[PDB]
Ligand binder design. Structure first.
Ligand SMILES: *[C@@H]1O[C@H](CO)[C@@H](O[C@@H]2O[C@H](CO)[C@@H](O)[C@H](O)[C@H]2NC(C)=O)[C@H](O)[C@H]1NC(C)=O
Ligand SMILES: *[C@@H]1O[C@H](CO)[C@@H](O[C@@H]2O[C@H](CO)[C@@H](O)[C@H](O)[C@H]2NC(C)=O)[C@H](O)[C@H]1NC(C)=O
Ligand SMILES: CC(=O)N[C@@H]1[C@@H](O)[C@H](O)[C@@H](CO)O[C@H]1O
Ligand SMILES: *[C@@H]1O[C@H](CO)[C@@H](O)[C@H](O)[C@H]1NC(C)=O
Ligand SMILES: *[C@@H]1O[C@H](CO)[C@@H](O)[C@H](O)[C@H]1NC(C)=O
Ligand SMILES: *[C@@H]1O[C@H](CO)[C@@H](O)[C@H](O)[C@H]1NC(C)=O
Ligand SMILES: *[C@@H]1O[C@H](CO)[C@@H](O)[C@H](O)[C@H]1NC(C)=O
Ligand SMILES: *[C@@H]1O[C@H](CO)[C@@H](O)[C@H](O)[C@H]1NC(C)=O
Ligand SMILES: *[C@@H]1O[C@H](CO)[C@@H](O)[C@H](O)[C@H]1NC(C)=O
Ligand SMILES: *[C@@H]1O[C@H](CO)[C@@H](O)[C@H](O)[C@H]1NC(C)=O
Ligand SMILES: *[C@@H]1O[C@H](CO)[C@@H](O)[C@H](O)[C@H]1NC(C)=O
Ligand SMILES: *[C@@H]1O[C@H](CO)[C@@H](O)[C@H](O)[C@H]1NC(C)=O
Ligand SMILES: *[C@@H]1O[C@H](CO)[C@@H](O)[C@H](O)[C@H]1NC(C)=O
Ligand SMILES: *[C@@H]1O[C@H](CO)[C@@H](O)[C@H](O)[C@H]1NC(C)=O
Lengths: 237, 426, 203, 318
């Protein structure tokens, strides 16, 4: 573990990350999208949600006439998130895999110190204690060549993995701009449903969005028409 | 699987623990019909030979050699070598088969053997220990000389001319009497091309004219031109051969091989597992042929379910209840006839607010590796050698530092989209 | 005198079947559209090996001689077709200008309306011969178009060759180490070739 | 010549002039996206050492290399199934189309399943006809007949129910009324559709016919998918051709080295082939990781195009 490998702290501590998710969330709750477009403008949360219903083509009165119900469905769905996250670790497979990939990469890089690559020993002090300079240099060249090829392999795979994590960080930054600081109309961008809002929660090496979405239910069949005649003229909705 | 993962606990999944590889059942060798053997009857079976104290050699070439018979031949009462043994020579080939033959008194012939000593080996029929082969001799008092003695013989370069006409007598024993002998040394002159029977349709090791490999030899419809011996695929790989003893064409298929994947529920749930031999046919390995490979230790099921452990080619496996691993064609979801018509619409009369969680990674563990300490472990003698590789260690530190600073930027771009730390009311 | 080679003088480079495929190979080939010396003869250089051909309806050209001196001092190839069988031998031969028709040793072997075409080369002490035959209409020059030459002889005789001459309408060209792309049809015959050094389109 | 960037056009601007379009054309622009590579795994002991025991022992001295190569290629292979599933499996139920085809004059028959064929559509059959040592190719999880059931379900939902099958359960709606919503979604008042319905249906049907003609007349449309197939074949053929290379060794045929030399000299010559073949395989795996990142960016784009363009109506220009 001592072998030149070092883990550096993030610039933001998890407490500073939690102050940002708190600020994003307190802005989102007290002011809607407005804190992304300018200064945060306060608006009552039952009025922010009526703007957010109106933003999916559901008329505002559908919130006010159902406000108790919609509030209870949100509170209960947040309860199901606690129960799911408390019950099983398997939800966070993305973040725990990112932790595992880096741990496996570092443990592979450390275990490769024990490989001979054709040298008389993989322990560099065995070579330098057993062999005199002209012989030792030939064996140490094999260890240098192998360990350098192992470290180029590690850095190449970490550059490709960092490009994957940056594609995910650009996606998370875009989800925060459009799903948290706004209301995205991009279908299935902010979770499966007509998107209302989302709340960022911090998680180690990542972020979690609680995408609040309107999902329709309890449909009935009806006869329908494209247009309606009246005084011989066609009327459209 | 536990050993593959270096763990005593195994989570639910499919793991490539091993590679299956059909072993060669036996070894074939094929070479052309044996021909052009050097005419050693002119050495050992002819009615006459030169006097050994005045002998000279000649070289066989563009030929096979009878050395495999000579290694057990009755034609000599004695033999010796300065090179490798005749059983090794029958398994070898040389630039030419240099050889000579002669008549002598038996002990005078022995005094000219390869690596021997005497006026024969010194000059009359030279025989340095550097001679690249073997020699043989036998008694000949009935034919190598007259009733008056060894007048047809002689005594005293390799196998070539202190010499005089031989003093041997026909009444003597094999050392004092007349004798016949020959000697030789070592491409164009080779031992015989021993060849096996042919074996189709088994996986076999093979040699054809010095091409070698393991494969399933199969009779084929390819039409090689009369001078062609081998066939090759697009990317150099040999894919047919002509049998050198019966000139039909054999198509070569590799001996069947593939990943062995172990399908397991978690070791919490069971110790029972199923094994997929990827791309292998079950004839080559419960047993079930999937399009992904032969699957062993899982039950084929006619029901369909969501995919638990993915096998491939539409097959998935799962652990079910009295319990076993099943394998099934995965369900893509329940089918649904949408109740369409030109005048029917469905309108939702209610809703559910659904709080769908989504999880996204944003930053790696920021790492920096001191490449001099990783590679050379605080050795000065090593660190001076690492300088000969120039910029590589600095370039690796620069790349990891770029990744590390990028993780802070990734984290900043996600969370720091808010200019002010907003606070929630009491 | 000279004539254009066109696309003539390509041969099967190795003993390998390939089919419906294009193979790129570097070998001693007659370069496309090179100039081929015409004769109706003296001793000639051998260089990196030779393409040889004759437009025929009579069988006057019976053979060849090859070596460094082609005479006495060292082992020298004599090659003859006598219509009974092909003869090859490598003795330190001695003759007049040639043993042509008035109409030590180390190895020996036995085996206008038409073109007879041949290639003679020597690599790693393997002296090699290739050939082809075709009907023709033109008498003055080598026919246009393509048909690959196929091996006849392949001898580990180890001789050094720098000169040759013919034994009695005939053409001589020199092979050069060049990349060619060779087209093998469904039956594994070569049916076309590209001399990669000929022009920018061939590159 | 110096290239022209396009025809020169002074737009007829003035502070009081506007140009309003008096008519339209329904265009049907095909777009083609890669989604998955050929899933590959290499038995790196069989590739590097050719089933030779003398070589196989030397390859142990290199430790984890011929194991993290398989972990890398397995990550790529699992990711191809994920890429394919993220694109097509955006549907909860396998929706199917009614027996009668009362779609207001629009004619999807060339893009819907043909049960006489896998049960692919006519255009899917053109698209499937236009594209043409220890190495193993692994099948996709979804077979081409499962992919065709997903594109059928997506298409049958899209026709019979609009965007609604993405946002919840599929709600049926007449196709002329779905298109009247699609007209409002571009800011064209919906009576423009119902009043031009036969013309708009004919423009769609004809524009679908031009796709069949285009896909029959030239292969050049599928250049993106054929390029992916060509790059996979080129990479695998390059990886196999590199077995013929010496890398400074006495021969590239491993059995020559093991027969021409004593064991001490043979191990030095084999270690050149191990080093060169291992560097060749690391080069291949590194290119496949970079190419898989390019294909994943294309699969994430295709998954987003399916969510917004198929399951919805994207207002994102171009
Ligand atoms: C929908 O369009 C298809 C062609 O895109 C029409 O099918 C063709 O119909 C004609 C006349 O019956 C036949 O001669 C062709 O053989 C058909 N082609 C194919 C590929 O089937 C189809 O008739 C149209 N359907 C409707 C209801 O208009
Ligand atoms: C709008 O443009 C369409 C073409 O895109 C016109 O439709 C064509 O009309 C002519 C007769 O004027 C017919 O011969 C063609 O067969 C029609 N084409 C199609 C695809 O139906 C249409 O007339 C134009 N409408 C107006 C009001 O200008
Ligand atoms: C070298 C040689 O030709 N040896 C032959 C031997 O093979 C044969 O068996 C014998 C007659 O029986 O005559 C002699
Ligand atoms: C609509 O009506 C059809 C019968 O006309 C029926 O099959 C279908 O299940 C109904 N759907 C709903 C949502 O009630
Ligand atoms: C080889 O010998 C056998 C008889 O021993 C004969 O049947 C076969 O045709 C021969 N093959 C060749 C290539 O001469
Ligand atoms: C497996 O067992 C451990 C305790 O040994 C438990 O924490 C874990 O939740 C179990 N997982 C499953 C899937 O059973
Ligand atoms: C190989 O598998 C197929 C089914 O995929 C089977 O029909 C065939 O019998 C198998 N081959 C042999 C030699 O049994
Ligand atoms: C399963 O399907 C096979 C044909 O594929 C059939 O022979 C068998 O009877 C079926 N069994 C059950 C229990 O459905
Ligand atoms: C709407 O659904 C909720 C449960 O999600 C139920 O409690 C409520 O009574 C329903 N309202 C109507 C009008 O059906
Ligand atoms: C040699 O061949 C070229 C055509 O490839 C021709 O232009 C040139 O004139 C020829 N040279 C002679 C001396 O005929
Ligand atoms: C022709 O050559 C053969 C050997 O190939 C020989 O036997 C024959 O005697 C020769 N005949 C003449 C007329 O030279
Ligand atoms: C043959 O070679 C010997 C030497 O080996 C030499 O004395 C003799 O003169 C040579 N004769 C000819 C004709 O080459
Ligand atoms: C052929 O030439 C080589 C040098 O290129 C020489 O070593 C060899 O002895 C020569 N052999 C003959 C038979 O002239
Ligand atoms: C292949 O050769 C056969 C005769 O051996 C001939 O009938 C056939 O036409 C040839 N096919 C091609 C594609 O040249």
């Amino acid at each position: 573990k001592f072998n030149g490998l070092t883990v550096l702290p993030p610039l933001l501590t998890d407490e500073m990350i939690a102050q940002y998710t708190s600020a994003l969330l307190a802005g989102t709750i007290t002011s809607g999208w407005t804190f992304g477009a300018g200064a945060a403008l306060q608006i009552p949360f039952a009025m922010q949600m009526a703007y957010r219903f109106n933003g999916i083509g559901v008329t505002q009165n559908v919130l006010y006439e159902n406000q108790k119900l919609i509030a209870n469905q949100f509170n209960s769905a947040i309860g199901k998130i606690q129960d799911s996250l408390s019950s099983t670790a398997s939800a966070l497979g993305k973040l725990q895999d990112v932790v595992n990939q880096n741990a496996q990469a570092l443990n592979t890089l450390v275990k490769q110190l024990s490989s001979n690559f054709g040298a008389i020993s993989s322990v560099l002090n065995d070579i330098l204690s057993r062999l005199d300079k002209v012989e030792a240099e030939v064996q140490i060249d094999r260890l240098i060549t192998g360990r350098l090829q192992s470290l180029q392999t590690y850095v190449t795979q970490q550059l490709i993995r960092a490009a994957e994590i940056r594609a995910s960080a650009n996606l998370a930054a875009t989800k925060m701009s459009e799903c948290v600081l706004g209301q995205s109309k991009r279908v299935d961008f902010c979770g499966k449903g007509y998107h209302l809002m989302s709340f960022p929660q911090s998680a180690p090496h990542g972020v979690v969005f609680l995408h609040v979405t309107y999902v329709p239910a309890q449909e009935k069949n009806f006869t329908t028409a494209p247009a309606i005649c009246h005084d011989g003229k066609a009327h459209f909705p | 699987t536990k050993c593959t993962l270096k763990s005593f606990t195994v989570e639910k999944g499919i793991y490539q623990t091993s590679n299956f590889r059909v072993q060669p059942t036996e070894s074939i060798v094929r070479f052309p019909n044996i021909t052009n053997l050097c005419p050693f009857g002119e050495v050992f079976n002819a009615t006459r030979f030169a006097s050994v104290y005045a002998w000279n050699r000649k070289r066989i070439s563009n030929c096979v050699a009878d050395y495999s018979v000579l290694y057990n031949s009755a034609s000599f009462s004695t033999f010796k070598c300065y090179g490798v043994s005749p059983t090794k020579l029958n398994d070898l080939c040389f630039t030419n088969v240099y050889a000579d033959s002669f008549v002598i008194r038996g002990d005078e012939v022995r005094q000219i053997a390869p690596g021997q000593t005497g006026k024969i080996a010194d000059y009359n029929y030279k025989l340095p220990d550097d001679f690249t082969g073997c020699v043989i001799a036998w008694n000949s008092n009935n034919l190598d000389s007259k009733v008056g003695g060894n007048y047809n013989y002689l005594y005293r370069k390799p196998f070539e001319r202190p010499l005089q006409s031989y003093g041997f007598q026909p009444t003597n024993g094999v050392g004092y009497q007349p004798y016949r002998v020959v000697v030789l040394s070592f491409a164009t002159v080779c031992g015989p091309k021993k060849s096996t029977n042919l074996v189709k349709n088994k996986c076999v090791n093979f040699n054809f004219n010095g091409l070698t490999g393991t494969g399933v030899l199969t009779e084929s419809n390819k039409k090689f031109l009369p001078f062609q011996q081998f066939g090759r695929d697009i990317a150099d790989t040999t894919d047919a051969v002509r049998d050198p003893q019966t000139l039909e064409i054999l198509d070569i298929t590799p001996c069947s091989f593939g990943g062995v994947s172990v399908i397991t529920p978690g070791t919490n749930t069971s110790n029972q597992v199923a094994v997929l031999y990827q791309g292998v046919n079950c004839t080559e390995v419960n047993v079930f042929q999937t399009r992904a490979g032969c699957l062993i230790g899982a039950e084929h099921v006619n029901n369909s379910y969501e995919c638990d452990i993915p096998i491939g080619a539409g097959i998935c496996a799962s652990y079910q209840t009295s319990q076993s691993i099943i394998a099934y064609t995965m369900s893509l979801g329940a089918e649904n006839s949408v109740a369409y018509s030109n005048n029917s619409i469905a309108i939702p009369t209610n809703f559910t607010i659904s709080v769908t969680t989504e999880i996204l990674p944003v930053s790696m563990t920021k790492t920096s590796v001191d490449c001099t300490m990783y590679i050379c472990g605080d050795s000065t003698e090593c660190s001076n050698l690492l300088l000969q590789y120039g910029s590589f260690c600095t370039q690796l530190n620069r790349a990891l530092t770029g990744i590390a600073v990028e993780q802070d930027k990734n984290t900043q771009e996600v969370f720091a989209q808010v200019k002010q730390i907003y606070k929630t009311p009491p | 005198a000279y004539t254009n080679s066109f696309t003539r003088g390509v041969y099967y480079p190795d003993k390998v079947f390939r089919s419906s495929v294009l193979h790129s190979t570097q070998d001693l080939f007659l370069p496309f559209f090179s100039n081929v010396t015409w004769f109706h003869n003296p001793v000639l250089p051998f260089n990196d090996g030779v393409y040889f051909a004759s437009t025929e309806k009579s069988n006057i050209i019976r053979g060849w001689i090859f070596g460094t001196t082609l005479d006495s001092k060292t082992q020298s190839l004599l090659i003859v077709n006598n219509a009974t069988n092909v003869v090859i031998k490598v003795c330190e031969f001695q003759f007049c200008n040639d043993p042509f028709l008035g109409v030590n040793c180390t190895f020996e072997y036995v085996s206008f309306k038409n073109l007879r075409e041949f290639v003679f080369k020597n690599i790693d002490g393997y002296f090699k011969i290739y050939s082809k035959h075709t009907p023709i209409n033109l008498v003055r020059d080598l026919p246009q178009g393509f048909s690959a030459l196929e091996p006849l002889v392949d001898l580990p005789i180890g001789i050094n060759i720098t000169r040759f001459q013919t034994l009695l309408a005939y053409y001589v060209g020199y092979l050069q180490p060049r990349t060619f792309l060779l087209k093998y049809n469904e039956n594994g015959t070569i049916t076309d070739a590209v001399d990669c050094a000929l022009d920018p389109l061939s590159e | 010549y110096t290239m022209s960037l396009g025809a020169e056009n002074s737009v007829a601007y003035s502070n009081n002039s506007i140009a309003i379009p008096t008519n339209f054309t329904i265009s049907v622009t095909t777009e083609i996206l890669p989604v998955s590579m050929t899933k590959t795994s290499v038995d790196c002991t069989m590739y590097i050492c050719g089933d030779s025991t003398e070589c196989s022992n030397l390859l142990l001295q290199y430790g984890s290399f011929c194991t993290q190569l398989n972990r890398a290629l397995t990550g790529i292979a699992v990711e191809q199934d994920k890429n394919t599933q993220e694109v097509f499996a955006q549907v909860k139920q396998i929706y199917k189309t009614p027996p009668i085809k009362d779609f207001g004059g629009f004619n999807f028959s060339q893009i819907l399943p043909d049960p006489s064929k896998s049960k692919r559509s006519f255009i899917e059959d053109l698209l499937f006809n236009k594209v043409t040592n220890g190495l193993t190719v692994l099948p996709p999880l979804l077979t081409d007949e499962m992919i065709a059931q997903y594109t059928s379900a997506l298409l049958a939902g899209t026709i019979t129910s609009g965007w609604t099958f993405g946002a919840g359960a599929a709600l049926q709606i007449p196709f002329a009324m779905q298109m009247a919503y699609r007209f409002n979604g571009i800011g064209v008042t919906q009576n423009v559709l119902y009043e031009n319905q036969k013309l708009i249906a004919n423009q769609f049907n004809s524009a679908i016919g031009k796709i069949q003609d285009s896909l029959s007349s030239t292969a050049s449309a599928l250049g993106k998918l054929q390029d992916v197939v060509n790059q996979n074949a080129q990479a695998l053929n390059t990886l196999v051709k590199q077995l013929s290379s010496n890398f400074g060794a006495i021969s590239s045929v491993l059995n020559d080295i093991l027969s021409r030399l004593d064991k001490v000299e043979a191990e030095v010559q084999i270690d050149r082939l191990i080093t060169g073949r291992l560097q060749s395989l690391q080069t291949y795996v590194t290119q496949q990781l970079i190419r898989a990142a390019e294909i994943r960016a294309s699969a994430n784009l295709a998954a987003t195009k399916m969510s917004e363009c198929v399951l919805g109506q994207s207002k994102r220009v171009d």
